[PDB]
Design a protein around this ligand. Structure first.
Ligand code: 5RO
Length: 112
């Protein structure tokens, strides 16, 4: 399949995922200066800005590459934050709502 339509699709999909994160809690890396124990629990931080950089660096060449980093955003947040927090529930909401975005986008990629 052709590269350019695939990257256009991933850009649109990433924008749709960011729209689901209405608090923008996943827009940029977790600020390690404020959370010095974060790396004690989380081996690979991820966020939507880093995903955009990876996309434009041609690091995502199949849908799994892209969805893996999305899943890291969600799983890191569930792991680090207590269940009774807004942050934890925001990851649950993103998993549910972003999952639906991802399933339709993957289907578009399969038509290529
Ligand atoms: C997504 C996430 O876990 C966080 C985003 N910002 C945070 C902050 C500021 C502290 C702890 C966790 C987070």
């Amino acid at each position: 399949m052709q590269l350019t339509p695939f990257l256009i699709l991933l850009r649109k999909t990433l924008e749709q995922l960011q729209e689901k994160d209405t608090g923008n809690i996943f827009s940029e890396p977790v600020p390690l200066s404020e959370v010095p124990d974060y790396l004690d629990h989380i081996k690979k931080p991820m966020d939507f800005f880093t995903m955009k950089q990876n996309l434009e660096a041609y690091r995502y060449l199949n849908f799994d590459d892209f969805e893996e980093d999305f899943n890291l955003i969600v799983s890191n947040c569930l792991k680090y934050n207590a269940k009774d927090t807004i942050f934890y529930r925001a990851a649950v909401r993103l998993r549910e709502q972003g999952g639906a975005v991802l399933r339709q986008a993957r289907r578009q990629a399969e038509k290529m």
